[PDB]
Amino acid sequence: ELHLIPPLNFSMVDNGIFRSGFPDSANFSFLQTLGLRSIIYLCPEPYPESNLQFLKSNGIRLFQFGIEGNKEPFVNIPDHKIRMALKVLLDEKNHPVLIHCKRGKHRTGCLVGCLRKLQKWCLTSIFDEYQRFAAAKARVSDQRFMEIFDVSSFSHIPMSFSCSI
Ligand SMILES: O=[P-]([O-])[O-]
C-alpha cells in the first residue's frame, strides 16, 4: 500500500521547485508522480546510466552545474555555477524542477538559500531552512556564501510562478 519513496532529504521549495539528495531506482516511482521537466544537478560526477534512462523515459532535461564536493574548512563554492543554476530555476518553462546534489544539504542548500534571497527572506529565516536540511552537517561557509552572494543581476526577473506574490 505505502509504496512511494521520496529521495534523500526530499522537500518542496516552492510551486514547481523541489530539492533532494541523489535519487536511486527506489525513488523513481515517486519522482515520476511529480511530472518533472528538469533536474538541476550540482555534482561534477557523470550521471549514472540508471538515472540517465529514468530522465530519457520520463522526458526530463538534465542541467549539470558541477560544484566540487569540498570539506570544511576547505570549501570554495563557485559563484558562476550557482548563478547559472539560478537562471535555469527562474525560467518557469523548466518547472517542475528537482535540485539535487549528493545529500541535498550543502550545494543544494546554497542554491535554495540564494533563491530565498531573491524572494526577500531575511538571512536568519534562510539560514534556519538551510540548517533544517543540513542538521549536524550544517556549514558556516555555506551560510556565509548565501550572505555575500550578489543577486543584483536577477532583480529584474519576475517570479509570477511563486506561492509568495
Ligand atoms: O551533496 P551535498 O549535500 O552537496
Author numbering: 50 to 214
Task: Please give sentences taken from the publication describing this entry.
Here, we provide the ligand/enzyme crystal complexes for one such PTP outlier: Arabidopsis thaliana Plant and Fungi Atypical Dual Specificity Phosphatase 1 (AtPFA-DSP1), herein unveiled as a regioselective and efficient phosphatase towards inositol pyrophosphate (PP-InsP) signaling molecules. Although the WPD loop is missing its canonical tripeptide motif, this structural element contributes to catalysis by assisting PP-InsP delivery into the catalytic pocket, for a choreographed exchange with phosphate reaction product. Subsequently, an intramolecular proton donation by PP-InsP substrate is posited to substitute functionally for the absent aspartate/glutamate general-acid. Additionally, we conclude that the hydrolyzed phosphate remains trapped as an enzyme-product complex, until it can be released in a prisoner exchange with another PP-InsP molecule; the latter process is assisted by the WPD loop.
In experiments in which crystals of wild type AtPFA-DSP149–215 were soaked with reduced concentrations of 5-InsP7 at pH 8.0, we observed a near-planar, triangular-shaped electron density consistent with a metaphosphate; all three of its presumed P–O bonds are an appropriate 1.5 Å in length. There was no evidence of a pentacovalent phosphorane that would have signified an associative reaction pathway. The putative metaphosphate intermediate in wild type enzyme is stabilized by intensive polar contacts with a cluster of residues in the P-loop, Lys151, Arg152, Lys154, His155, and Arg156, including the latter’s positively charged guanidinium group. A metaphosphate is an excellent target for capturing a polarized water molecule, to generate the Pi end-product. We identified a potential candidate, Wat2, in both wild type and Cys150Ser mutant enzymes, and in both cases Wat2 could be activated by the His155 Janus residue. The Nδ1 in His155 is in the Nε2-protonated τ tautomer state, stabilized by a carbonyl oxygen from the backbone of Lys186. In addition, a π-cation interaction can be formed between Arg188 and His155 which is expected to further assist the latter’s deprotonation. Nevertheless, in the wild type enzyme, the 3.7 Å distance and 144° angle from Wat2 to the metaphosphate are not an optimal environment for this reaction, which in addition to the latter’s intensive contacts with P-loop residues (see above), are factors that may assist our crystallographic capture of this proposed intermediate state.
